[PDB]
Amino acid sequence: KKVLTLEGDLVLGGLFPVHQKGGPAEDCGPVNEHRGIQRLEAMLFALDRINRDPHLLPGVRLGAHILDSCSKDTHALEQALDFVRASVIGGSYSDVSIQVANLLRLFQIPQISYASTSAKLSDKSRYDYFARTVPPDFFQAKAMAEILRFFNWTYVSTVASEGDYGETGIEAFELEARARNICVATSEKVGRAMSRAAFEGVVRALLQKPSARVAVLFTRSEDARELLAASQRLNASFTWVASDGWGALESVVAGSEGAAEGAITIELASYPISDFASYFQSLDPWNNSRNPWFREFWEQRFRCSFRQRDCAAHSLRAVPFEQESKIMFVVNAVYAMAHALHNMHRALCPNTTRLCDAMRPVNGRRLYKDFVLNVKFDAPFRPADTHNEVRFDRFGDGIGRYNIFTYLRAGSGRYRYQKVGYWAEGLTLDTSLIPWASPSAGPLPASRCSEPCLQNEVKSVQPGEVCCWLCIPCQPYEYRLDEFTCADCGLGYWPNADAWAVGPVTIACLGALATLFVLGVFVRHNATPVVKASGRELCYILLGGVFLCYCMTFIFIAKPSTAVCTLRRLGLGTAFSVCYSALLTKTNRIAISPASQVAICLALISGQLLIVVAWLVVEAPGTGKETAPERREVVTLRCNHRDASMLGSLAYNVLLIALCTLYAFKTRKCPENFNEAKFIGFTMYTTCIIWLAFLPIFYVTSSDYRVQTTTMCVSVSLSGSVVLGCLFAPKLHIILFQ
Amino acid sequence: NSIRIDGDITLGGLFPVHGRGSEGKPCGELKKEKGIHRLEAMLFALDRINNDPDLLPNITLGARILDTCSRDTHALEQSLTFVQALIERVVGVIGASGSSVSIMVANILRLFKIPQISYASTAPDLSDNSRYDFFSRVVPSDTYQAQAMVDIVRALKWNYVSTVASEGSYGESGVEAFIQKSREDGGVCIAQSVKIPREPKAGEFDKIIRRLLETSNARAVIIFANEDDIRRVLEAARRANQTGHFFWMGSDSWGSKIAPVLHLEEVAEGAVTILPKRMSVRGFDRYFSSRTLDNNRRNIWFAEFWEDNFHCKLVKKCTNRERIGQDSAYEQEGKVQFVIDAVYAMGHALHAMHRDLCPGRVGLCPRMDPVDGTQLLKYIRNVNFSGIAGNPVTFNENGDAPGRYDIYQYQLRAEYKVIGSWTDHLHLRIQQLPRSICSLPCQPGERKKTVKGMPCCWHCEPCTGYQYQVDRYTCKTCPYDMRPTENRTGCRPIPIIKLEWGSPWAVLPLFLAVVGIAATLFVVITFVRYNDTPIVKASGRELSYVLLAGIFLCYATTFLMIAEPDLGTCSLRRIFLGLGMSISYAALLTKTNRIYRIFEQGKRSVSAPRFISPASQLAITFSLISLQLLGICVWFVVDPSHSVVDFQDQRTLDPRFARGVLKCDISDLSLICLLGYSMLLMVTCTVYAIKTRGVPETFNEAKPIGFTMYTTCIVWLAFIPIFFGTSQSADKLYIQTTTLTVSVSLSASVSLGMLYMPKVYIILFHPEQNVPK
Numbered sequence A: 001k002k003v004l005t006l007e008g009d010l011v012l013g014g015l016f017p018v019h020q021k022g023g024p025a026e027d028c029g030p031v032n033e034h035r036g037i038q039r040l041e042a043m044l045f046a047l048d049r050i051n052r053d054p055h056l057l058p059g060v061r062l063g064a065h066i067l068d069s070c071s072k073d074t075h076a077l078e079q080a081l082d083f084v085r086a087s088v089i090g091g092s093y094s095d096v097s098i099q100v101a102n103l104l105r106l107f108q109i110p111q112i113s114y115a116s117t118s119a120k121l122s123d124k125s126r127y128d129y130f131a132r133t134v135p136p137d138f139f140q141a142k143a144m145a146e147i148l149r150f151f152n153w154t155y156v157s158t159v160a161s162e163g164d165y166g167e168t169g170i171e172a173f174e175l176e177a178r179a180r181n182i183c184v185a186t187s188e189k190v191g192r193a194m195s196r197a198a199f200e201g202v203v204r205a206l207l208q209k210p211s212a213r214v215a216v217l218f219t220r221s222e223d224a225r226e227l228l229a230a231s232q233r234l235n236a237s238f239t240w241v242a243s244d245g246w247g248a249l250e251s252v253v254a255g256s257e258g259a260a261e262g263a264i265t266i267e268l269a270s271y272p273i274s275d276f277a278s279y280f281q282s283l284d285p286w287n288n289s290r291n292p293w294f295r296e297f298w299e300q301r302f303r304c305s306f307r308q309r310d311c312a313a314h315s316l317r318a319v320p321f322e323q324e325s326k327i328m329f330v331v332n333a334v335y336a337m338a339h340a341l342h343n344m345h346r347a348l349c350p351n352t353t354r355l356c357d358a359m360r361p362v363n364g365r366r367l368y369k370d371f372v373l374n375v376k377f378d379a380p381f382r383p384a385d386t387h388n389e390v391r392f393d394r395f396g397d398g399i400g401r402y403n404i405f406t407y408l409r410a411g412s413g414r415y416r417y418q419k420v421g422y423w424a425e426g427l428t429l430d431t432s433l434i435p436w437a438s439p440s441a442g443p444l445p446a447s448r449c450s451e452p453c454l455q456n457e458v459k460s461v462q463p464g465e466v467c468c469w470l471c472i473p474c475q476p477y478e479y480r481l482d483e484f485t486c487a488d489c490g491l492g493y494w495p496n497a498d499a500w501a502v503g504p505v506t507i508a509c510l511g512a513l514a515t516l517f518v519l520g521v522f523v524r525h526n527a528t529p530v531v532k533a534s535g536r537e538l539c540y541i542l543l544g545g546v547f548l549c550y551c552m553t554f555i556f557i558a559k560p561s562t563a564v565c566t567l568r569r570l571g572l573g574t575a576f577s578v579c580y581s582a583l584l585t586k587t588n589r590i591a592i593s594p595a596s597q598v599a600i601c602l603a604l605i606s607g608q609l610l611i612v613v614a615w616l617v618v619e620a621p622g623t624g625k626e627t628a629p630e631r632r633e634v635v636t637l638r639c640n641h642r643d644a645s646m647l648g649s650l651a652y653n654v655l656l657i658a659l660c661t662l663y664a665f666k667t668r669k670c671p672e673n674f675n676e677a678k679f680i681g682f683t684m685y686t687t688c689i690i691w692l693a694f695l696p697i698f699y700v701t702s703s704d705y706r707v708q709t710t711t712m713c714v715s716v717s718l719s720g721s722v723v724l725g726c727l728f729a730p731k732l733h734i735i736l737f738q
Numbered sequence B: 001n002s003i004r005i006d007g008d009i010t011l012g013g014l015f016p017v018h019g020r021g022s023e024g025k026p027c028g029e030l031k032k033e034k035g036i037h038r039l040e041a042m043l044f045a046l047d048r049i050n051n052d053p054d055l056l057p058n059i060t061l062g063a064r065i066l067d068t069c070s071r072d073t074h075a076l077e078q079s080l081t082f083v084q085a086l087i088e089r090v091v092g093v094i095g096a097s098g099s100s101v102s103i104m105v106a107n108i109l110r111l112f113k114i115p116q117i118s119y120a121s122t123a124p125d126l127s128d129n130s131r132y133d134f135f136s137r138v139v140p141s142d143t144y145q146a147q148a149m150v151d152i153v154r155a156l157k158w159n160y161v162s163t164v165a166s167e168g169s170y171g172e173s174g175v176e177a178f179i180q181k182s183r184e185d186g187g188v189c190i191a192q193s194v195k196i197p198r199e200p201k202a203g204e205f206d207k208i209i210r211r212l213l214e215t216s217n218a219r220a221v222i223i224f225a226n227e228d229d230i231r232r233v234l235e236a237a238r239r240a241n242q243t244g245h246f247f248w249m250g251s252d253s254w255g256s257k258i259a260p261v262l263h264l265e266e267v268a269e270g271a272v273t274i275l276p277k278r279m280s281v282r283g284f285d286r287y288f289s290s291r292t293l294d295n296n297r298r299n300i301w302f303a304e305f306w307e308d309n310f311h312c313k314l315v316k317k318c319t320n321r322e323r324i325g326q327d328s329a330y331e332q333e334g335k336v337q338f339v340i341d342a343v344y345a346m347g348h349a350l351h352a353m354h355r356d357l358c359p360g361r362v363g364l365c366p367r368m369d370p371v372d373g374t375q376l377l378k379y380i381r382n383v384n385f386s387g388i389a390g391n392p393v394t395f396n397e398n399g400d401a402p403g404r405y406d407i408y409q410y411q412l413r414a415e416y417k418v419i420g421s422w423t424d425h426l427h428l429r430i431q432q433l434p435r436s437i438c439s440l441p442c443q444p445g446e447r448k449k450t451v452k453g454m455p456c457c458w459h460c461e462p463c464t465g466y467q468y469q470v471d472r473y474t475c476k477t478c479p480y481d482m483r484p485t486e487n488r489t490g491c492r493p494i495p496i497i498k499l500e501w502g503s504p505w506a507v508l509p510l511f512l513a514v515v516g517i518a519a520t521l522f523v524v525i526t527f528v529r530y531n532d533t534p535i536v537k538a539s540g541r542e543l544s545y546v547l548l549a550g551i552f553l554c555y556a557t558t559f560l561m562i563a564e565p566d567l568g569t570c571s572l573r574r575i576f577l578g579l580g581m582s583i584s585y586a587a588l589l590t591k592t593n594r595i596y597r598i599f600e601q602g603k604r605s606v607s608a609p610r611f612i613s614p615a616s617q618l619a620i621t622f623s624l625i626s627l628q629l630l631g632i633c634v635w636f637v638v639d640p641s642h643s644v645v646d647f648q649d650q651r652t653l654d655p656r657f658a659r660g661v662l663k664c665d666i667s668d669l670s671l672i673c674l675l676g677y678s679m680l681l682m683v684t685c686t687v688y689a690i691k692t693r694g695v696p697e698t699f700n701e702a703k704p705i706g707f708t709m710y711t712t713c714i715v716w717l718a719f720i721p722i723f724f725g726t727s728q729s730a731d732k733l734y735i736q737t738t739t740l741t742v743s744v745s746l747s748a749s750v751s752l753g754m755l756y757m758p759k760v761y762i763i764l765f766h767p768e769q770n771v772p773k
């Protein structure tokens, strides 16, 4: 009926729960001392201070139409509409703040809540012009997730009440959690309207998944009570944290002081206005009659009656005064609106010290987007030691301050809340104040499983425990694929997608030089008996075997193709098909004239090796990188005829003369130039042995392509040279020394 | 201000009596064709409801009417008087009009639990029941009419179109619904979409047309805008001389309304627009036509109705007696059925409520004064009845009437004729007018490339090179067998070139080789006739035999080098490319060596060189021949004879001139290696000729042999530079072949010129000289 009408140049309407619900009996119940009247009086104290403020709106006296919500939606609109008719700060409970916004926006009238938090009033597609002096409990997600990060704590069970605010906080928490790589072990909502066993069931469900032995709660305290009672009854072993829906609330921790130790709560930090507490404590509305609902307040606050003027004898100040911290939002809402108006006037009435006609109409968005959210200062009457940067984000979220505190063991007294730290936009905490984490207390109970193993080891794929997957190595040829395996690369060792070769080069070159230095001795002496008595064409085919060993050595190291590996294998015949075989006729003539005997031998040499040539030039397998799933960094192989028994045909070609003819060793007894006759008998035998000594490399070195290439290259050059000298010794003795 | 009609219960009503307007009057001209036409009809229906013994029995239904103007901020402010009566009491409203008018009001009345019904705005937005929990239309939304427009464009087989809409939820979401449904169908691309401001500038419309005309593959335009917006565009069309350039179309925003088309009748010929399925109301048409304009009580604008419909005061004051039906002042109102329907529908819902809420009463029941509109809403959705003119009244729970509407054609001679109808499917029959379709179809070989990703559009790109078509969008390379059809429908044989033995160049060796054989035989016959005469025996009769056979083959080989390709040709060619060169040298080596050995042997011993006897010497010649035969056999083994067709050599830029070649596949490796061995015998012969420089004239053939080699080795060696130098020519098929034929035939000629021809002359013509020299 009454609206505390205040006079002014600009009138701000508003809406407070002066009365409780009268349910179906009356529309209005008794007055709300703490929710209604104290908040209104604080509003008025602030409004009078604003009108008397030398810097804030000096040209605009603020009048008012403050409505009685009667704690009902019906009244909120029957009365909110009066401010439209008349041409807003209000909203305590939320059904009211929402519906009022639905009407005010239609007339381009902005609304700031002073107490209503609800996250639904974030939806600007339905509620565009509004601001919330208090951020909804959704925000606590941010702090909650940060507390878990502080603790290195991460993998965790979580709970809401049956609250839609509970859903809101849980969804919000999931978002903030995922952003920080924090995993839900498991979670649920919790009815008020369920048996104690159901509350125990919730606690058991936590305790039934002990991958971490810790949890977090969104709630309202009636639930937090029975949850904490169930925790205590079950002797539940965990640590846990709650939303300020159970912040502090000594009342919850009374049945279960012991279980209550393992926990922290947020509260929105309290910064009571002592100036207003003073004004209210000394307030005496009997005389200061402006607020019409005080007569009821007096009668019930002090037990008296004004019917007989009995309350008149009991000054209101007689009853001790206390206030909710909430008073600061009542005040911030009026100052924030006044400031928005102030800035609006600086923008629309820039050169005038009194309200301008520009502000007679309702301005919509001009207030809302440009001045209402763009508020930034320290709140008046706030304790001097701190700051709240009153501001709103683009959705009207009033930016705020929050105490983070734990319930301490008191072996010498009652258990007490203790500030550990605070939240603001981020978290600060002193660990020494935590009973389960301060270093002397030991570590937090399991709150972890496994690391971001996403590398040379990658996660397992353990069913269920995804956020707890084991760490497992890949295999030494692969590259990163998923969080849990690796793709096979190209060929090479773990790709992430000839040291002694100088040996054979040196010996081959030296072999060739020595070979020809000696040939020139034999050739210079072609007209000398040392050559006339020799199978000179064969002497030369034999000597040439070392020169060929040299040539073959370089072929042996040619980039692999069938063009060269066939020759390579044949070359292991060739070297002695000539280096041993000339002994055949030397031996024969000492042991169809000699000229023909030589031609016959030459034909035999070529014939037998050519049989083998025919056998190898027809082999299909060639060169490549077959390599091995082992080693992997093996590059460019010679033809894949490893340990091929066809090689025995080369050994044969040599033994065909070298072992199979040694009856002729008797030649050493022949009375013709004994220096040579003795050596032919000696060297045929010795040579067979020397060559056989080199031979085993055919299988011995097959395990390593660089080693066997290097080895055969040296052995071929060396074997040939060692052997030639076996008989050249007496030939050169005579030529060079006689 | 407003009309206040007494009754026992009251129903609100809302209509654009004014349009929008200026800042001082947001309410300019009277829109009589949405407003007062329909208002009287509502009031008519209101009286009929009150006069209906079976509807709201014993209850007078009163009313409250307001003028929307059109700028909907006027609606609400007003709604506030209406609202104070709601919270003299009003039960509900007929609210309707355009978008901004309906959507603002749906958000105020629902907050007091007051139901609202629309005879008008079809916009999608109002089907959000979380925002319009108290609301229904009485018509199908733009979700249907947009689909219908898409179906009609697809029935026109058009693909490419321009749209225009003015501001406000109706236009802006409506055309956006058409755009999205068109895109979902995929059979259409939007050339463009043009917004009209609520307050456009004059001349913008000419600019709009010029923009509409840029997309010249469109000949049609779609409209959701209001009446006036359309005249500004079609008036511009007259100025722009676009009359009959275009098809034009409308959602419900315009149609049977005559003020759109009048004075611009040729503009938008055949234009197709939609109206919600509508019938006239004869009882009203009659009443309206016959009503005296000063006998209409409780209608504050009816005096204005006279003034605007009769173009004079009710100065030119004219007699009030004239019926509106007697002048141009009168016609049938296009939507009157809906406004009458909507008010009855609420009356029927109220009736259903009384039979529920107040089942034992007629006349007033106190329970309905503070009636919970939720129950009123239940009957708004639950009541189903045959409406006025027999049109069934039903709408779903989001308040859409189910889709049903009629398709009209603007016919000149001029009226909107029915083309057909739609209920999620078209039933149209056809007037002949332009087409709106994007890219035009493409020729054979014109492989389409899509214009961007735009489904209805392409570039008709002609296929190229050796490619032939495989899809409307795709062409692919024809294999080596063929060069494309010019139409690129497929592919056609590469013409294959053969080496012609009669070509201008092939004819030279073709006949020289024959002459060579004839000359060789002249010599052979003489030698045979004189086989037992010393003049023949002295040079080695058998050695002569082999040399002459060699010469014969040299020429036979060259003749055959230009022989028609076959496998028989390849095998014989390869064996003889070798033999036709090597036999001659093998024979020369044997004989030349015999001379050299005798010459040097005589310096040390009288004994003839051992094995110089023909018994061994002939074998030497044949052994050298066999060594080559074995090498040739290897060449056949590693890479065997084949008659093949070369496509790759002349795959030219213009495939009509692409030519393949039918050739014997003799690799240049063997073409040379088959000659290389023979060359080495030639080299050896040259060396023997050098070794023999000290040989005296007493050796009958020692000198002319040296001479044959002096020339022969050049004839041959000249082959290589030419063979390779000409290897890059398009004509190499005959150039390299004749290069080879010429040196082989010439070498044969050289041998005859020094060793046989002058000897034959003496053997045959001078018997007195037939001595062993």
Ligand SMILES: N[C@@H](CCP(=O)(O)O)C(=O)O
Residues within 6 Å of the ligand: B016, B033, B034, B035, B037, B038, B097, B098, B119, B120, B252, B253, B333, B334, B335, B336, B339
């Ligand atoms: N303004 C209305 C015209 C039809 P009415 O006469 O109002 O029923 C409309 O846009 O649909």
